[PDB]
Amino acid sequence: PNFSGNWKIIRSENFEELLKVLGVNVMLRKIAVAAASKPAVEIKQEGDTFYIKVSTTVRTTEINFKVGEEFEEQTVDGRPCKSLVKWESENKMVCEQKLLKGEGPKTSWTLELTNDGELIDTMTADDVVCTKVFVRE
Numbered sequence: 001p002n003f004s005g006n007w008k009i010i011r012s013e014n015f016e017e018l019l020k021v022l023g024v025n026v027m028l029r030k031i032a033v034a035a036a037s038k039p040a041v042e043i044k045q046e047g048d049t050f051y052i053k054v055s056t057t058v059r060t061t062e063i064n065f066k067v068g069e070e071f072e073e074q075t076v077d078g079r080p081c082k083s084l085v086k087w088e089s090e091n092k093m094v095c096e097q098k099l100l101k102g103e104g105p106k107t108s109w110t111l112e113l114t115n116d117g118e119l120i121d122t123m124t125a126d127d128v129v130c131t132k133v134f135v136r137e
């Protein structure tokens with residue numbers, strides 16, 4: 001499994017709903033949903049070391065991590081967290097997030113590469129799940 005590539009979105013579900021249940025107000029949701037409904041996703045994978053760049057009309061997020069080693073991130077609604085990615089299976093990784101301060105919904109993201117070569121991303125807050133599917137350019 002090599003997640004490396006530039007990935008282009010073909011399906012999305014529940015993105016605004018995820019922001020809504022996290023408490024994001026409607027004005028900010030509409031900006032977010034417009035800016036981030038065709039996110040460009042680039043991955044460079046070198047074994048267990050990953051670089052991910054997600055680009056929207058208003059934000060560039062670059063993440064660098066090694067599977068099994070804690071790193072710093074912010075949650076999708078902007079709260080500082082410490083993150084840790086593990087392999088769930090050979091083709092799917094899960095990022096658990098812990099808030100640095102205070103309490104809040106349990107948040108995570110996952111990335112899975114299917115046999116057919118699609119990339120499935122999920123982002124969760126408690127029991128609400130956003131799912132996006134991409135193909136390699």
Ligand SMILES: *C/C=C(C)/C=C/C1=C(C)CCCC1(C)C
Nearest residue numbers: 036039041052054061109121132
């Ligand atoms: C609309 C979906 C996103 C903006 C997702 C971004 C994203 C990934 C696709 C995987 C790495 C984490 C994160 C930046 C949250």
